[PDB]
Each structure stands twice: as structure tokens, then as C-alpha cells.
Amino acid sequence: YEALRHFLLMEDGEFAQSLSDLLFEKLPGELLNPLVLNSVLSKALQCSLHGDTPHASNLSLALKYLPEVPDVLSCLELRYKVDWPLNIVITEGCVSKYSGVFSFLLQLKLMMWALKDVCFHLKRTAMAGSVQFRQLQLFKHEMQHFVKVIQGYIANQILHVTWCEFRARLALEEIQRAHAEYLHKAVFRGLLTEKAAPVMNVIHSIFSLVLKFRSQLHPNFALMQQSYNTFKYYSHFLFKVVTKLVNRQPHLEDFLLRINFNNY
Amino acid sequence: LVSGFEATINKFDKNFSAHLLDLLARLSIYSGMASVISRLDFNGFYTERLERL
Amino acid sequence: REIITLQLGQCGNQIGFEFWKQLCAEHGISPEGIVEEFATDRKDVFFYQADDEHYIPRAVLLDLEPRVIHSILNSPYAKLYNPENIYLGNNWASGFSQGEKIHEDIFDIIDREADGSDSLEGFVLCHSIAGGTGSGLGSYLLERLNDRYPKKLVQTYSVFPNQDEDVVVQPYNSLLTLKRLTQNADCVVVLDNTALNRIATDRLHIQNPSFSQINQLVSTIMSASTTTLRYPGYMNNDLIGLIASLIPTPRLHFLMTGYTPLTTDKTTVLDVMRRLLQPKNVMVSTNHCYIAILNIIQGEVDPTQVHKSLQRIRERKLANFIPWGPASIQVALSRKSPYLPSAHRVSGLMMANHTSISSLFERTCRQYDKLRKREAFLEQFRKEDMFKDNFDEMDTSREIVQQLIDEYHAATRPDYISWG
Amino acid sequence: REIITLQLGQCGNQIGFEFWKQLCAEHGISPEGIVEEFATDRKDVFFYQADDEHYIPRAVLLDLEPRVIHSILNSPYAKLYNPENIYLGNNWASGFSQGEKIHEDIFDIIDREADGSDSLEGFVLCHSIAGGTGSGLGSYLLERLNDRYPKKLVQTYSVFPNQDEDVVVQPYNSLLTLKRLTQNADCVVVLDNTALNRIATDRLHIQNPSFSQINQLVSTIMSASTTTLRYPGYMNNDLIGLIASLIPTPRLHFLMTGYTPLTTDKTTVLDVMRRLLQPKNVMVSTNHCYIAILNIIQGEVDPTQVHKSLQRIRERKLANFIPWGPASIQVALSRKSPYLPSAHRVSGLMMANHTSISSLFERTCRQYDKLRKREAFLEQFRKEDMFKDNFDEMDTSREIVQQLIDEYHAATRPDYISWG
């Protein structure tokens, strides 16, 4: 379990920061055929100097979103393969959700890649006090601030509070239930569940506008200004929707907390 | 010399490319480990010229 | 992927030697650079991949007229590193001209170390301002790094050169250096000698040996800022992801420093949160408001009660803020620093963009304006006159810092929708 | 089947005596040539089948005006060999004329040893360039071996005659010798006195006794190159099977030398692989690319992890290469050298065809062009004028080496489909 956490919850230094950056170069035929996704993992584990375990190799690897391209979905699934003397405890529907939480997690880094791209496209323009540079980068900061704090919520819920559970349980029917309740609460506090689904729903509008903001690199200053203008309305609308669903969730109260300190 | 030698070597060259591309096609199906194909033509040229996608 | 660390100037070489002795203490490594069985951490951040799989740190030492560098050299931590990156006048123009004349071989040392590493992520600058030849040379070296590598990140560890009174051209030096820091740097970590001296006289009754203990505080702050990268966490294991959150615009990119323990001779999360917010705990010395606050916490701390604490700090409404923008305080956690015994295990650190630094900038501008109107304290050099005959470079830098003060006070307003 | 070894020139006789003392140390044999009970290896490579079933090595010694050969003779390793194959001016033309005038009796010694052996596989030439009379005589002897035996293989161990400055006709000597090496040799193993001197001053602080230690390095390299033949392995137990892989065309047949231990006063396969790839480990001193690389590894090395290592080096993509051809790095392994106690047991050796040698060739051509345009450093001899009255032989050799430089840089291109 404490090996699975390294490579599907990405508890590894510059493994996410090296897998995601190589994967997102593609979106074509690349990152579809089984010789390219077959080799990005062998490069990613070696440049983190934490991996290269048998819990990180000889595991099955595929994808569920093909690159056909906005694109708010990441790709490259990873599965943790188990067999008979591990099957009595570790479930094979539980592992499909291990892949499912890894994919959501890599999609979170997709925004941290896209905003980095548009700040990188802007970098060669300047240092200077030219208006088209400074007033454009002021938009980027806000979206990066949004991404870091929704990430600060997720990096607490799926990784600390649910990881306390089933770690003080390891300090015949029972061990399966202790495993499944742990992953069940991990996907529950991640707000992917149907109960807190409208809270995560507006983040996709957030994310699509971040992609529109990434695509352009300034004559096209006004278009990116307008994309940011739609983004700010959607954030000010999220501020009410998350508050209303604490009368439905004390765990969600940390999220309304996260996105704003004071402020209306 | 430099011309009739070219005449013999080109037909040997074409035959060898046919007999090689067939082998690499029938080796891509065999695995296990991918290091067999990767080491056999380790350059990155003629590693397979009948590429897929 | 790997960051090349530079120690520059004489006092900057002193605090760099302190920081590398601190890394020898912090990681499980010998003073010969040797990895041990009491070393599992990440060693791809500041450590040159030295040849025997012994991750030797990168201590690039650039200086002119070395005096304290010899005392650094006769030490057992000069066997921890020496890949031959050690190399062998109190005004800005003198150090500028000295950096200009020997740029090529020291830049060959820089290219040497850059090709020596597997890749590059950034250049962090370990410097103390008002080291004599270090000032001026530091701005020229900052310009060389910014010109040669415009796709990398430059961080500047710098002190605020004010011991409350000798160098009287120091406001001119800091003024020109601050103009270069606005345009040739992406993030600058500023510390205050005044606030560090006041906190040092607060915790104990030291006034004579205070410099060596302030070096220890600087070394611990530098260790705590990079512990999240050097030791495997999940967030801010990269430089750029850590830097991107605090800076809204590349002119307001100066971050204040604070540190939760006062003395080093359970503690719950609510304590350290409102502890780090108090300005007694900030080691940097009208309405002024933070732009964005971020904290690291490393110790015996439960990661669950941080949302309860952050709820308490939210409903406390304890800091004001920049009141037109969606910025928050950002809570992040890293591992407790292993492989060495540490007293007072819980220690947190803040980097925050505050418009209060514009007050100290305006104090430096007022001192510069006073000494400029008097014009008897430039201490007229041939370097100062030869670098600029009409001395209009200080006026251009004054225009830059005046624009910076205007942008700071416009960000202080709830209307910074257009630039001012 | 058996290879006849020749030591030629004064410095070549010195390094040959070093190599035969090295073979007396390496095999379990006495300094009288006697096979012992501490000797099971193969003795059909360099050992003359001497009569008492005592496999005495073949040390064919050809020289004029012997001075250091007497010091070789008064040694207990002159009882290891003496089947009477020992025989008793710093320009190329002088040594050429000296080799021409006494060709018949020394060729009778060659035919004597050739009929003495059971058969012949090749003639390996143990020489150091710029030995005075050794240069010129070596090219004439190379021409005699190439003319008399066109069905055998000739290998040339040679140093690059450059001590970075006395012989000032040395670029002329090396230029004419290189023309002969292009046309009268099938493979040439070139070493650099510059890189060996730099590595010697790197490992220790020797500058005066450096020649004797470079002789030890040359002797160990010569032992490691032939350990796979002298001791029973499976591959490269023949000369021609070892030589055939690295050479694509008989003009690009010069191989660089490298060696994994730096000092001689577990270690896994990934370490020695990327160790041997680094040019700090190559004892030979724009875009340049290897044609083909092959390594021997002899030590405490597991033969299974070499495919894991070669996978890591493959996906590392650490060397560029000649980018239009199906060449690879080729991994081969031989036995650890027995019957003598050796420190630093793991030692690997590379022979690789690199176009970087054309840069040093162009340096020698530039030095030759400078001294030729000046024409005050030919040191005009009667031998030099009598061998060629108009001195057009150096110009013809210059045309040959210019064609070689053109072929090298055309092989550097991804288009060498037609010759250039």
C-alpha cells in the first residue's frame, strides 16, 4: 500500500513533474500506440531517483482517453496488478479506482502545465514595462492561484486525512472492508462523489477557460482578457454554490475556506 | 570496378532489405522483454522501417 | 532538474559556507562528501552528481580579493565540496567594473558546471548585501545570468543593508541593485538586518557575537525553504511551482521572511498559524496589506487539524488583505527534517508578498535623496565617475524604484485594474 | 593461428619490454620462460612454441644505434625470451633510409620467426612514435610487412607525438607516417601523450616520473586488449573477429582508447558503462560522432545485469551517433585476469571509431602547413633532400590526409552514401 501511494498518488519528488511534462507534449498518433506510452514511464521513474521498484515495473499500462484533440482530460492510465494470495484482501474493483484516482490526479497537473505554457510563451516578450506584457500576466497569476489552492485542498483530503485511516489499522472478512472503506472515503473527500458533485462541476468551466487562456501566446490581448473575464464570473459564482452545500458537509467547509480568506 | 560493383551490390542490397524488413516484422510480434528488438538494432535507424502509426 | 547554487561576495560566501555546513549536518553525509548508510532522501536539487555516487553540493564561489575565503578553505567542509568551482572597493561601480573585466573565465566556470549537471532548473544566489566588492558585482552577475539564460529562474537571497549606522554610498548601492533586481530577477527573498538584530537582542542578550548567530538563523531559513524540495513531499518539490503562487506581477516579487521558533534552547496547528501571522515573528522590519501568504510547516504536526485551524483563522479574520483580488493564505506541509537530532521540532516558515516593503524602499529613497541633494557622501571614486560621467544611472534607477513605489501603493488600493 | 609480436624503435622497445614483464607477471611463468604449476590458460597467441614446452613470448627487436636496448638486455626478463630475435637521426627520411639499407637480414629474422611458428595470424606492432630513428623506419617496416604479407592483418599500437612542446620535423614525420598508416595498415590503435599526461597529472601530482607510469598504463591497456585472446573466452579470441566490427571502411580505421579505473591504489555494470562513455575516461584527447563503440569488461561483473544496464544506456540516449547507419555499441565480456593479485578488480576498455580524431589530424595538418610555409624547421638534412629532391612526398601525403579529413567529415554527415 505504501508503495502504491508513491506511483498512483504521486508521492515522489519530480516524478509527476517529469511524467506529465513529457506526456502533454503530444496533444495525434503519439501517446496512442504501444511503444511510446511504453517508454515514458521508464524515463519518468529514473529521473525521480525514488522509483524503479517491482511495485513500479511489470505493471499493466494503458489509457482510457485517446488523444484526438480544449482538452480538460488527461491520459495514460496505470494499474497495480495483483494475483491470488493478494486477492483475498486486495480487491480488483478497488484497483480500477486506484487507476481512477491517478487519472484525476494527473489531470490536476494538466492545469499547472498549461498555465506554465502560457507564462512561458509570454516570457520571450520581456523586465520591460510594456503594457501588453504586464497586464496580460496579471491574468495568469489569478488562474495559477486558483489551481494551487484547489490542489491544496486535494493534497490534504486524498492524501493526509484518508491516509491516516488504514494506516492505524495496519499499526478474514475484516481486512477487505478496512481496505475498501479507506478508498471509499478517499474518493468521498476528493468531491468526485455524487453528493458533492456540483462543487467539482464548476471547476470544469474553470478548466476549459484555462485551456482557452493557454492556447494563445499582443494583438490577441483582448481575447485572453475576455477568457479571463468569463473565468472571474465563474469563480464568483462558485463562492455561493460551495457555501450552500455545507447545509446538505463539514469536510467541504475547508474548501470554501481554501478558495477565499475573507472576500466576497 | 566502381560501376559493375555497384550493379552487383544494389541487387544484394535490395534483397537484404526485403529479408530484413520481414524479420523485423516477425520480431515485433515476439516479446516478455522489449530489449530483444531494442538491442538488436540499437541505433534508431533500420530499427524497423515498416513502422506502425 | 538540478539547481546550481552560487555563493557570491565575501559575506555571501560566509553564509554559503554556513549553509553547506548546514546541509552536511542535515543530510547523512560526511565532510568528505561521502554518502553514508545513515543517508531515503532526494539528492538531485543542490548536489552536483560527483563521480563516486557521492552527491557533492554545488558551491560555485566567485569573488575578488579573497580574505575570508581562505578561512572557508582551511576547513573540513572544503573536502565536502571542491569540484574547482572556487575562484581566487566598497562601491557599486567598482564591483560592477570588476565583474565586467573578468566575465569570461568565471562564465566559463558557469558553463563548466552547467554542462557538468544533467540539466538545469535555476540559479539561486546566496549573497549578503554590503559586502564591499560583492555589491555591484552581484548586479552585474545577475545581469549576466538573466541575459544568458532567459528561460530559467533566478532567486536572490539578500539582506536589507541597514545596521542603523562605514559605507555611506550604501543607499546608492542598494538603489542600483534594486533596479537590477526589479528587471533581472523573477523572485527575491529579502531579509532585514534590523529585524534580525532586534529579534537576536530579544531572544538573548547578545550584541557582540550577534552576526554568527544571524548566520545560523539565515542557514536554518535557507534549509527550511528548500527542505520541501530536498526531501520527498508532494507539493513545491519544484522551484517554479513554489514561486508562481506568491507573485501576481513581476515587479511585486519581493517576499518577507518569518520563522516560528524564537529560541531553540503538543504544539498545535492553531498556535503556529496565528504565530506566523504576527509581525514579531517576521524577520523583516498608513495602510499596508499582504498580497498573498504561503507557509511551510515541518515538525510534529497533524495534517488533519490544519483544516480546523484554517477554519479558525478564516472566521478570526485576523489579517486585512489586498481588498479586490482572489488571493488567499495557502497552507502547505512538508516532512520533518530527518537524519539529525533537532530540538524544538515544529518550525514553520512564511514567504509573503507584502506592500510594507515599499515603506523601507521609500526610506532608502529618502536617504538617497538626502545624500544626493547634499552630495558629499558618494565618496567620489574614479570608478563611480568612469561608469557614469553625469551620474544619471542613479536617477534612472530612482525612476524605476519610483514606478515600483507607485505600483506598490496602487496594489495597496482596491483599484489596480489599470496600472499605476 | 599464433601472432608474432614486434617491438620496434627505442621507445617502442621500452614499452615492449614493459609489456613482456607485464605478461610474465600476468601469466604464471618464471623470468626464465618456464611454465609453472601456477600457470588453465591459452598460450598460442604471443608465445613462441619454445622447445621445452615453455611457451616463451615472441619479442622481435629491430633497431639501429641501440642505447636503451642494452638496459633492456641486462634484465632477468631477457631470460624469459631470447630466441635471438633481438638485433643490434631524428627524421623520417633518415629512419626510412636506415630501414631500407639493412632490410634483408632483418627480413631473414622475420622469415626465421615465421617459419619457427606453427602458422601466422598477424603482426602486431609495439611502437612509440617520435623515438628518433624509430620514426620512418616504422613506416618502412610497415610497408615491408604489408607488401610481403597481404593476406595477414597488421595492428599498430602508436602514440600521438605531441607533448605540447626537441623535434620540430615531428609534424612532417607524423604526416608521412599517417599516410603509410592509411594505406599499409588495417587497424591502428592510437593513444595520446597529451591526454595520458593530463590524466596522470589528474590522478596524482607527478610531472617528472610521469613517463614510467604512462608506460604502466600502456602495458595494462595492451594486456587488457589481448586478455580475451590469451585467456579462454568465447568471443574475440581471434584478432580479425575483434577488428571487423569497428571499421566500416579501411580509411576510418583509427580507434580511440579509454580505461575505467583512474587510480589503482559492488561496482555495478551501469557505473562502468556510462563511465567508459565519458571523455574524461578516454585517454585520447563542431559536431563529432562515434562510428561504432565496443567495450571489453573484465572483473567482478555479473553478466546478467549488462542487459539491464544496456537498456538503461539505450533509453538514456547518452551519445549522439553517426546518424544514418545501423551501428550500435557492442557489449562483450571476458574473464577476470587470473594467477596474479590485482587491486581494483573491475577494469573495462573501449576501442571506438570516432571522427574526433580528425580534429587532431587537422591540428597536425595546420602545424605542418605553418612550418611548411615558413620552411625553417625541416632542419634540412641530406637524408631528407636525398629521399625526395623536390619534397613532394609530404605534399602527396598531405593530399592523402586531406582526403582522409574529407572522408571523416563526410562520415560525420548523415549523407555518406556517395564518397566524399
From Swiss-Prot, chain A:
Primary gene name: TUBGCP6
Reported disease: Microcephaly and chorioretinopathy, autosomal recessive, 1: A syndrome characterized by microcephaly, cognitive impairment, underdeveloped retina and choroid, and epilepsy in some patients. The more anterior parts of the retina, near the periphery and pars plana, have a grayish hue and diminutive vasculature similar to retinopathy of prematurity. Visual impairment becomes evident during the first year of life.
Function of the molecule: Component of the gamma-tubulin ring complex (gTuRC) which mediates microtubule nucleation. The gTuRC regulates the minus-end nucleation of alpha-beta tubulin heterodimers that grow into microtubule protafilaments, a critical step in centrosome duplication and spindle formation.
Subunit structure, as described in the record: Component of the gamma-tubulin ring complex (gTuRC) consisting of TUBGCP2, TUBGCP3, TUBGCP4, TUBGCP5 and TUBGCP6 and gamma-tubulin TUBG1 or TUBG2. TUBGCP2, TUBGCP3, TUBGCP4, TUBGCP5 and TUBGCP6 assemble in a 5:5:2:1:1 stoichiometry; each is associated with a gamma-tubulin, thereby arranging 14 gamma-tubulins in a helical manner. Gamma-tubulin at the first position is blocked by TUBGCP3 at the last position, allowing 13 protafilaments to grow into a microtubule.
UniProt signal peptide: none
Family the UniProt entry places it in: Belongs to the TUBGCP family.
Compartments (UniProt record): Cytoplasm, Cytoskeleton, Microtubule organizing center, Centrosome
Name recorded for this polypeptide: Gamma-tubulin complex component 6
Species this protein is from: Homo sapiens (Human)
UniProtKB/Swiss-Prot annotation, chain B:
Tissues showing expression: Ubiquitously expressed.
Compartments where found: Cytoplasm, Cytoskeleton, Microtubule organizing center, Centrosome
Disease implication from the record: Cortical dysplasia, complex, with other brain malformations 15: An autosomal recessive disorder characterized by global developmental delay, variably impaired intellectual development, speech delay, facial dysmorphism, microcephaly, and varying degrees of cortical malformations including pachygyria, thin corpus callosum and subcortical band heterotopia. Most patients have generalized seizures.
Subunit structure and binding partners: Component of the gamma-tubulin ring complex (gTuRC) consisting of TUBGCP2, TUBGCP3, TUBGCP4, TUBGCP5 and TUBGCP6 and gamma-tubulin TUBG1 or TUBG2. TUBGCP2, TUBGCP3, TUBGCP4, TUBGCP5 and TUBGCP6 assemble in a 5:5:2:1:1 stoichiometry; each is associated with a gamma-tubulin, thereby arranging 14 gamma-tubulins in a helical manner. Gamma-tubulin at the first position is blocked by TUBGCP3 at the last position, allowing 13 protafilaments to grow into a microtubule.
Family as reported in the entry's similarity comment: Belongs to the TUBGCP family.
Entry function: Component of the gamma-tubulin ring complex (gTuRC) which mediates microtubule nucleation. The gTuRC regulates the minus-end nucleation of alpha-beta tubulin heterodimers that grow into microtubule protafilaments, a critical step in centrosome duplication and spindle formation. Plays a role in neuronal migration.
Protein name according to UniProt: Gamma-tubulin complex component 2
Taxonomic path: Eukaryota, Metazoa, Chordata, Craniata, Vertebrata
Residues of the full protein shown: 814 to 872 of 902
From Swiss-Prot, chains C, D:
Protein name per UniProt: Tubulin gamma-1 chain
Protein's organism: Homo sapiens
GO molecular function list: GTP binding; identical protein binding; microtubule nucleator activity; structural constituent of cytoskeleton
Major location category of this protein: cytoplasm
InterPro entries the record matches: Gamma_tubulin, Tub_FtsZ_C, Tubulin, Tubulin/FtsZ-like_C, Tubulin/FtsZ_2-layer-sand-dom, Tubulin/FtsZ_GTPase_sf, Tubulin_C, Tubulin_CS
Top-level taxon in the UniProt lineage: Eukaryota
Modified residues (Phosphoserine): 119
GO biological process: cytoplasmic microtubule organization; meiotic spindle organization; microtubule cytoskeleton organization; microtubule nucleation; mitotic cell cycle; mitotic sister chromatid segregation; mitotic spindle organization
Database matches in SUPFAM superfamilies: Tubulin C-terminal domain-like, Tubulin nucleotide-binding domain-like
Disease listed for this protein: Cortical dysplasia, complex, with other brain malformations 4: A disorder of aberrant neuronal migration and disturbed axonal guidance. Clinical features include early-onset seizures, microcephaly, spastic tetraplegia, and various malformations of cortical development, such as agyria, posterior or frontal pachygyria, thick cortex, and subcortical band heterotopia and thin corpus callosum in some patients.
Function in brief: Tubulin is the major constituent of microtubules, protein filaments consisting of alpha- and beta-tubulin heterodimers. Gamma-tubulin is a key component of the gamma-tubulin ring complex (gTuRC) which mediates microtubule nucleation. The gTuRC regulates the minus-end nucleation of alpha-beta tubulin heterodimers that grow into microtubule protafilaments, a critical step in centrosome duplication and spindle formation.
Intracellular or extracellular location(s): Cytoplasm, Cytoskeleton, Microtubule organizing center, Centrosome; Cytoplasm, Cytoskeleton, Spindle
Keywords: Cytoplasm, Cytoskeleton, Disease variant, GTP-binding, Lissencephaly, Microtubule, Nucleotide-binding, Phosphoprotein
Chain positions recorded as GTP binding sites: 130-136
